[PDB]
């Protein structure tokens, strides 16, 4: 079997990317973040305490003639924003792009915390991280994918996210006509449960490539590109006025500014992230200081290659038995 399914930036920016999931006999479609950094299928629900939920669209089990209670299953996450939520299991039918797994778990949330209740465009997550980062209490579930990964064609998902356009997760099979050149495989280290790469090095716009071994995840779910603060300060070195503020929590840049870009070492590979995707436009509305979407790890723990850095690519998620990563220019 394969799926196919359209992803959508949330908003100008490319804050986050929806793609639509039908959950529950007859469907239930609702707009989830296919987060590769987690592993919870969560949703708002029903169940959502009624105050925190605003715009969402909502998960109703008692009208899915297919959801079935897991007994005595609760969840909790927490993300690397601070953001957090809760709630009971369902197993329910869920479908992805005409891909369809029976007996998923759908975690129904009961409390979200207030950055989910403030974006009315998110319905939920989709985790696709490595099944032993599930937070489902007592008995951890499986993702989407490691449910569906026997039936698929090829045990891969890909993602090839737009810059300001829509984009494509593909689960199955790797499409050839949405790439240039060849795909870089990579090794991952799944003992985090992440994928968890190791980047060749980096080069700041039409500089010279700095070989330099630089261990971080491929999130879907995060937007910027989080990385050392050596290479995050040789970046914005480059552009004139940019500077870390501790006020905005980050770097910021005038708004007048031209980008270089940001390349990133995959082998022998380099993919190219050109200047325009690391502008986060405005601190604040009519601000003329500009958030870089090129930030410093230090505070993390790990280095985060997020949507800035996903989005210059095609990216394949081998989930053979020993998982790798590729990389390919389109």
Same mark, same amino acid.
């Given at each position: 079997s394969t799926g196919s399914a359209t992803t959508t930036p949330i908003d100008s920016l490319d804050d986050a990317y929806i793609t639509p999931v039908q959950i529950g006999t007859p469907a239930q479609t609702l707009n989830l973040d296919f987060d590769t950094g987690s592993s919870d299928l969560w949703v708002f629900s029903s169940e959502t305490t009624a105050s925190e939920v605003d715009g969402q669209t909502i998960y109703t089990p008692s009208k899915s003639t297919t959801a079935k209670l897991l007994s005595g299953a609760t969840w909790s996450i927490s993300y690397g924003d601070g953001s957090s939520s809760s709630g009971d299991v369902y197993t329910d039918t869920v479908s992805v792009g005409g891909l369809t797994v029976t007996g998923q778990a759908v975690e129904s949330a009961k409390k979200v915390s207030s950055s $989910?209740?403030?974006?009315?465009?998110?319905?939920?997550? @989709?985790?696709? *991280? $490595? +099944?032993? @980062?599930?937070?489902?209490?007592p008995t951890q579930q499986k993702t989407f994918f490691d449910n569906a990964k026997a039936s698929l064609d090829s045990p891969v998902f890909t993602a090839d996210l737009g810059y300001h356009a829509p984009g494509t997760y593909n689960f199955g099979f790797i499409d050839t006509?949405? %790439?240039?050149?060849?795909?870089?495989?990579? *090794?991952?280290?799944?003992?985090?449960? $992440?994928?968890?790469?190791?980047?060749?090095? %980096? *080069?700041?716009?039409?500089?010279? $490539?700095?070989?330099? +071994?630089?261990?971080?995840? *491929?999130?879907?779910?995060?937007?910027?590109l989080y990385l050392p603060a050596t290479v995050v300060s040789a970046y914005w070195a480059q552009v004139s006025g940019a500077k870390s503020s501790s006020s905005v929590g980050g770097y910021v840049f005038p708004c007048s500014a031209t980008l270089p870009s940001f390349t990133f070492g995959v082998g022998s590979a380099r993919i190219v992230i050109p200047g325009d995707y690391i502008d986060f436009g405005p601190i604040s509305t009519g601000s003329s200081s500009c958030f870089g979407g090129i930030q410093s790890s230090a505070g993390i723990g790990i280095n985060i290659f997020g949507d800035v850095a996903l989005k210059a690519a095609f990216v394949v998620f081998n989930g053979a038995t020993t998982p790798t990563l590729g990389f390919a220019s389109k």
């Open positions: $989910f209740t403030e974006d009315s465009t998110i319905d939920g997550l @989709l985790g696709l *991280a $490595f +099944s032993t @980062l599930n937070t489902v209490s006509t949405a %790439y240039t050149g060849s795909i870089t495989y990579t *090794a991952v280290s799944t003992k985090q449960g $992440f994928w968890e790469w190791t980047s060749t090095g %980096y *080069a700041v716009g039409s500089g010279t $490539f700095k070989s330099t +071994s630089i261990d971080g995840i *491929a999130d879907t779910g995060t937007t910027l």
